[PDB]
Amino acid sequence: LFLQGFHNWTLNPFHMMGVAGILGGALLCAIHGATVENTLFEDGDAANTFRAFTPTQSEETYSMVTANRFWSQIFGVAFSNKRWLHFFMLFVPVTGLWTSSIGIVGLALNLRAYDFVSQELRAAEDPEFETFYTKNHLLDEGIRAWMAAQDQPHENFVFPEEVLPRGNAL
Amino acid sequence: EVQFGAYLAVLLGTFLPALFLVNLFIQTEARKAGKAGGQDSD
């Protein structure tokens, strides 16, 4: 919350690529985990399908052709290569951690994606132009004023109540 | 008012890397057509 109020870190496109890689990695974990588990081959007579696998077997334990057939008709697009599938499970979360590391190096120097200046210039001269963008800046000015005296106590920030930005009745 | 150099940055940043990949895909299919040996090889 410090880096939302002071840096607008959600607005940064490098955090956005990081969110896409992490949520895309958890998606790829769940889809590949459930696709294998629901395209398994009948290799035993037990309803418990965990017993019907040998760690040294050479046959594939699940049907890739059926799994490709399922997602081609559900989603339109399916994996056809198990090697490309498992490289993609590596690629997505690691790219997300590397792209979000680039934007946090930018926040070290306060080279932040703070303002869209064309919306800030329009909202300055037109006091009904409101977006969800400009509403988020008022949240950040609340964070930076209400937490700064307690979060930076060495600085001896003394804000009187009259200078703290509040909305009406709160 | 937006930055006028961003029209160049977005549109050349889209088109030139996209046309590079369209270039790579087309020569891949043309190389397969030449090796196939019939009516598209010449």
Binding site: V65, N68, S72, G76, V77, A78, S80 | V2, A6, Y7, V10, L11, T14
Partner: peptide, 30 residues
């Protein structure tokens, strides 16, 4: 005027998704 660029990029992205689904390389055995 930049909303022309924003619309073209989104509609252009959806056209790639159309061709990726219906003009895909069909996976073939043997």
């Amino acid at each position: 005027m930049e909303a022309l660029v924003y619309t073209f990029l989104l509609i252009g992205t959806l056209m790639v998704i159309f061709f990726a689904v219906f003009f895909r390389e069909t996976p073939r055995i043997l």
